[PDB]
Structures are given as structure tokens and as C-alpha cells.
From a paper:
ΒΒRF2Δ is monomeric both in solution and in the asymmetric unit of the crystal. [name] has a compact globular architecture that represents a novel fold different from other known protein structures. Arg27 on the bulged loop between β1 and β2 forms salt bridges with Asp85 and Glu122, two highly conserved residues within herpesviruses. In addition, these residues and two deeply buried water molecules establish a comprehensive hydrogen bonding network with Asn123 and ambient main chain atoms. All of these interactions contribute to a prominent hydrophilic core at the center of [name]. According to the Dali server, the fold of [name] does not resemble that of any existing protein structure. Thus, [name] represents a novel protein domain, and we named it herpesvirus tegument fold 1 (HTF1).
[name] is an [name] tegument protein that has putative homologues in all three herpesvirus subfamilies. Here, we report crystal structures of [name] alone and in complex with [name]. [name] binds [name] capsid protein MCP and capsid-associated protein BPLF1, whereas [name] associates with [name] glycoproteins gB and gH/gL. These data elucidate the molecular basis of the functional association between [name] and [name], suggesting a role of [name]-[name] in tethering [name] nucleocapsids to the Golgi membrane during secondary envelopment.
Residue numbers in the entry: 10 to 173, 179 to 277
Write the structure that this text describes.
Amino acid sequence: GPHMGGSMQKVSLRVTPRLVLEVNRHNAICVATNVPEFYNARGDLNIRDLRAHVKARMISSQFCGYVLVSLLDSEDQVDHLNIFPHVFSERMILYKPNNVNLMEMCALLSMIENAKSPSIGLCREVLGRLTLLHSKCNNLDSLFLYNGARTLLSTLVKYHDLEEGPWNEGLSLFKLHKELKRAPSEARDLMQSLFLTSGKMGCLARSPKDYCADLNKEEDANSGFTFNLFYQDSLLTKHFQCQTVLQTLRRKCLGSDTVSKII
């Protein structure tokens, strides 16, 4: 809570890294992509191929870092963001740590967010790998990334009823989002309007990829840059439908400001 003497103990201001994608550039093209599914049908994690992927990224001439945004739990309304655009822009960074272990933690965050059908086995495997990686870094960035991944995993475990523990409560508004679906209709609609339909970041697009294509068309005739986005629709990637999010993503992925430390 915000530590206000007890009345707001369920209001969470916890900061979690979100919307994590790999950014690559060559020629005048820039692409933001989710990390691939380095696991089998049972959710056994393919550490060998994951590690090889991250090592390839660190030495690649195309790799620009991981794009991510730090969001407060109360800002994250599943498919709407309660945050002003100028605040959101400052929260989004292009992160390129010179450390394979921190890069692997970022890759796992992307994998968590983009998992289509996560299982409890996958969530436990990923958590175990993150615990090991954090134990090898033991710095403030790895703590932030470990805590964030645990929060996101916990959100999936709760939302999808994967446990019939190491989990926290997850993002608080995801719990409300699930619970309201079964509330009586009039109360459901009012509480969704009150607590889960922020307008501060504007309208949502049916097709993020077509919206990004239209952003490219504006400068096509003048040989402008091309930006494209690839991600997997899931509980944790709904914010890529926000048009202002996509405009900010495009600007940040094409911009020059890379940081090597988060905290």
C-alpha cells in the first residue's frame, strides 16, 4: 500500500516491468518482437535454446535491447491504462544491459507475457530459472526483474486457476477484472466503468499490426523508417491495442536513448 495509516492497504503502487519485447534494427527497418516459446508441450523450459538465443542477441549487430515500461499496479487495468501519456512515455525505456543473465531475465519476462496457454508447470519452471538468474546477479536490476516476473506469473496462476506457494496476489486489477465477469449486470457494468475503463491513454485498435502499418505509410513516400510489431495476444499483452501505446513504442524503438541500468 501507499503507507497512509491503514485506510488504503489494498491499493498497490508496486512497480512491474511490462510490455517486454526484443528490438532489432537494420537498414531503415525496426522490429519489436516477443521472445519465442522456448518450452515444450508439458511446460519444460528449454534452457539450452533460451540461453543460446540470448547469447546470440548480445553479440548480434541488429540487437538494440529490450523495450519495456515500468507500470504501477493501480495503473494496469488489463486492457486500459490509468496513466497520462506524458508519464507513460517517461516510463518506457530501451534496456540493453551488458550482462547475459539480466538479458535472459528480460527474455523470460517477454516469454511470460506472450505465453498463449500457460500451464502451472511452465510457471514453476520459469520461476525456478529466474530465481537462479537472480542468485547469480544479486543486484537491483535483477531484484526488480525477479519481483516483476513473480508478479506476472502470479497474475496468470490466479487468473487462469492454474493451481488446484511461491506466488503473490499478482496485479490487483486483474483479480477485479476476473471477479466482475460474474457480478450481476448493472453492478458489473458500473464497477467496470469506475475501475477498469480509464480513458487517459485513449482508444484501442482492432489490429495493432495494421495500426503500425498505417503509421509507416505516412512517411513511405519520403523513405521514412519502417517500424513493425510482432507479439502474441494474451491476458498480459492487451495494452498493445492502445493506439497511444503503439505511437510511443514506435518513437522509443526508433529513438537513440538506450540505458544499461534500470534502477
